[PDB]
Amino acid sequence: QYAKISGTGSYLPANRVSNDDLAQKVDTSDEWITARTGIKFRHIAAENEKTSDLAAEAARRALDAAGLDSGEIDLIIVATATPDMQFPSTATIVQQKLGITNGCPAFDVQAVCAGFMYALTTANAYIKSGMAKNALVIGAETFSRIVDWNDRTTCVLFGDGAGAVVLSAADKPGIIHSKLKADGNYLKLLNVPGQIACGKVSGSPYISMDGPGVFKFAVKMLSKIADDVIEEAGYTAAQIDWIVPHQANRRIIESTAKHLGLSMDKVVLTVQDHGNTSAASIPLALDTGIRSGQIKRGQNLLLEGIGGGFAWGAVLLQY
Amino acid sequence: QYAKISGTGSYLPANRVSNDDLAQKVDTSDEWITARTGIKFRHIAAENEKTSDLAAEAARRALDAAGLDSGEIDLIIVATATPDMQFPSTATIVQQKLGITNGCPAFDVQAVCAGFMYALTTANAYIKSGMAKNALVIGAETFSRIVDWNDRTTCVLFGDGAGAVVLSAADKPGIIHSKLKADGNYLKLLNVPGQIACGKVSGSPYISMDGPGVFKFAVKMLSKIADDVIEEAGYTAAQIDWIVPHQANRRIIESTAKHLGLSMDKVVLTVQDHGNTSAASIPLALDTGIRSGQIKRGQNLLLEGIGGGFAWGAVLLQY
Numbered sequence: 001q002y003a004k005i006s007g008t009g010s011y012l013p014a015n016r017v018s019n020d021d022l023a024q025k026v027d028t029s030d031e032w033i034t035a036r037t038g039i040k041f042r043h044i045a046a047e048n049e050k051t052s053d054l055a056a057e058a059a060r061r062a063l064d065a066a067g068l069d070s071g072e073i074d075l076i077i078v079a080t081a082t083p084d085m086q087f088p089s090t091a092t093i094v095q096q097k098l099g100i101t102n103g104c105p106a107f108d109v110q111a112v113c114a115g116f117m118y119a120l121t122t123a124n125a126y127i128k129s130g131m132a133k134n135a136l137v138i139g140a141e142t143f144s145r146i147v148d149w150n151d152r153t154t155c156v157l158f159g160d161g162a163g164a165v166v167l168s169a170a171d172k173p174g175i176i177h178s179k180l181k182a183d184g185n186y187l188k189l190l191n192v193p194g195q196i197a198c199g200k201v202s203g204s205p206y207i208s209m210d211g212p213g214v215f216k217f218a219v220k221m222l223s224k225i226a227d228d229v230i231e232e233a234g235y236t237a238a239q240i241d242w243i244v245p246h247q248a249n250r251r252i253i254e255s256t257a258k259h260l261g262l263s264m265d266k267v268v269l270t271v272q273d274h275g276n277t278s279a280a281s282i283p284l285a286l287d288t289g290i291r292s293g294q295i296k297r298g299q300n301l302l303l304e305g306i307g308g309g310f311a312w313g314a315v316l317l318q319y
Numbered sequence: 320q321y322a323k324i325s326g327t328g329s330y331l332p333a334n335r336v337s338n339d340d341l342a343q344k345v346d347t348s349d350e351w352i353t354a355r356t357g358i359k360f361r362h363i364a365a366e367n368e369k370t371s372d373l374a375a376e377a378a379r380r381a382l383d384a385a386g387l388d389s390g391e392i393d394l395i396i397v398a399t400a401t402p403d404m405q406f407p408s409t410a411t412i413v414q415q416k417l418g419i420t421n422g423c424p425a426f427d428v429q430a431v432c433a434g435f436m437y438a439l440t441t442a443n444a445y446i447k448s449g450m451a452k453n454a455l456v457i458g459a460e461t462f463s464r465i466v467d468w469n470d471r472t473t474c475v476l477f478g479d480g481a482g483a484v485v486l487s488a489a490d491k492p493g494i495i496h497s498k499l500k501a502d503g504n505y506l507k508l509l510n511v512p513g514q515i516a517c518g519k520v521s522g523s524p525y526i527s528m529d530g531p532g533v534f535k536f537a538v539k540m541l542s543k544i545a546d547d548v549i550e551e552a553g554y555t556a557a558q559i560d561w562i563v564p565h566q567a568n569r570r571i572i573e574s575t576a577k578h579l580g581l582s583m584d585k586v587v588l589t590v591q592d593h594g595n596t597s598a599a600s601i602p603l604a605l606d607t608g609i610r611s612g613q614i615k616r617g618q619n620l621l622l623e624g625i626g627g628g629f630a631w632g633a634v635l636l637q638y
């Protein structure tokens with residue numbers, strides 16, 4: 001069997017925040033942020049909405065885009081690093097809000113920024129082994145609530161959003177090949193140490209990051225893994241119509257595109273509008289590219305990214 | 320391809336707590352707890368150890384039982400409702416602690432009490448689609464740190480522990496058939512509402528449970544899902560050598576066994592010693608049954624359980 005993209009959808013919270021707006025609350029500059037990351041705007045969730053709310057709306061739009069009823073879904077996977085609750089799963093909460101009562105399996109995957117690729121690959125495994133026919137794969141994050149807004153270095157980097165994909169069984173390949181990786185030795189470079197223990201937060205509840213280090217290894221790792229997935233599938237970088245990378249830093253994206261010998265004209269870019277949305281970033285960009293007319297059916301797409309762990313991956317697929 | 324248990328392992332923290340111990344802490348009785356659940360003992364993690372520690376130890380024992388080096392693992396999945404951190408995944412932390420630097424994929428799954436079956440089914444999907452050859456599937460929990468020990472109704476129910484399995488590609492089936500289910504409408508019956516947001520805990524940091532409701536639906540749901548997996552696989556209840564259920568409540572297990580028309584002599588039972596260890600419960604019983612001389616190869620095992628979500632499932636396999 002094969003897994004193909006039936007539809008895509010995305011949701012960004014109403015409050016769109018520019019660098020200048022944020023410049024009021026924190027000691028930063030629009031020019032400084034842009035030079036570092038290429039980020040100009042963020043979206044921050046409203047007080048009353050959480051990851052499940054963002055995720056549900058994106059899924060709703062993904063379901064409409066695929067012309068599918070909620071009851072047709074037989075698998076739900078949510079990739080998030082900011083679940084609604086300690087437990088149960090955010091996926092079950094999303095399931096409930098989508099009005100899905102067909103009893104389909106639902107669970108969260110935790111791979112941080114690389115979560116959607118981890119969730120997408122997982123759904124692909126279910127479909128190929130015949131365990132599911134129509135899976136709902138969602139990357140949804142509310143990182144604004146685990147950011148230290150008194151830390152100018154990290155708080156300007158992250159945003160909120162959700163991206164959803166309807167992945168379905170097919171005779172011909174959508175997802176051609178994928179490659180996931182992880183190395184726990186890089187924990188210290190990006191993490192939120194805190195946990196809920198004994199009625200309180202134990203450890204730091206905020207994101208700790210090592211920018212230079214993350215930058216150093218991301219460029220190194222992403223170029224290698226990209227080359228692997230391509231040559232392993234039997235392709236070359238020239239047969240790739242689009243790169244849909246994780247949108248944390250444009251400098252990193254520029255570097256990777258150059259290594260594959262691809263023009264930035266073959267790279268979907270949303271980092272300037274969204275910032276680092278973690279697991280929601282890739283499906284956000286994918287939906288943005290599809291909705292903007294850039295991504296066309298039959299085209300070969302290279303999904304790619306690295307996240308906290310470190311965990312990283314790349315997914316080659318034909319839209 | 321097919322996925323088979325190559326080796327098994329388990330770990331329970333040193334601090335063993337009897338019902339009488341809790342009777343000092345809370346207005347309860349040993350007989351009352353035993354009458355409700357059949358639980359006599361629990362294990363509580365030490366101050367310095369967390370889910371990754373319990374998980375790592377269980378995995379080492381599982382690795383030894385399979386005669387495998389850590390470097391042979393090309394997939395790690397941890398099922399937990401009590402991760403070390405907000406992020407990254409506990410699986411990467413476990414990966415690091417096992418000294419695995421081969422870059423294998425690692426991520427957490429959240430299905431609460433049904434976590435191990437979700438992870439096992441997930442690992443199974445990876446193996447059948449040829450995406451992995453030797454997977455490390457771990458259920459590890461430190462629920463003691465999300466229990467309100469001033470609540471007699473819930474605190475006597477849960478314990479800490481970790482159970483691991485090495486699942487590997489094979490010519491003949493280990494995992495014959497599985498069926499996972501979820502319904503977010505039963506959220507209010509079992510949950511830990513709290514989350515880390517804006518530098519503090521937002522919502523209740525402790526487990527909230529509806530005993531009668533969970534009991535009511537578990538018996539009804541588990542009998543149904545059990546019957547389904549059997550009939551779908553083409554087996555009968557009589558062809559089952561062992562039931563390896565989730566060990567939350569002995570009354571529920573008894574009820575389920577009587578429904579399948581099976582004797583308690585064909586049911587591995589550890590609830591009295593372990594209590595409800597969530598995702599660790601099933602692999603704990605499985606490892607115990609194999610090591611105690613009860614479970615023999617070629618025998619048919621029925622893994623089963625329900626957890627917060629609700630999420631539930633049953634897994635039919637031949638050891």
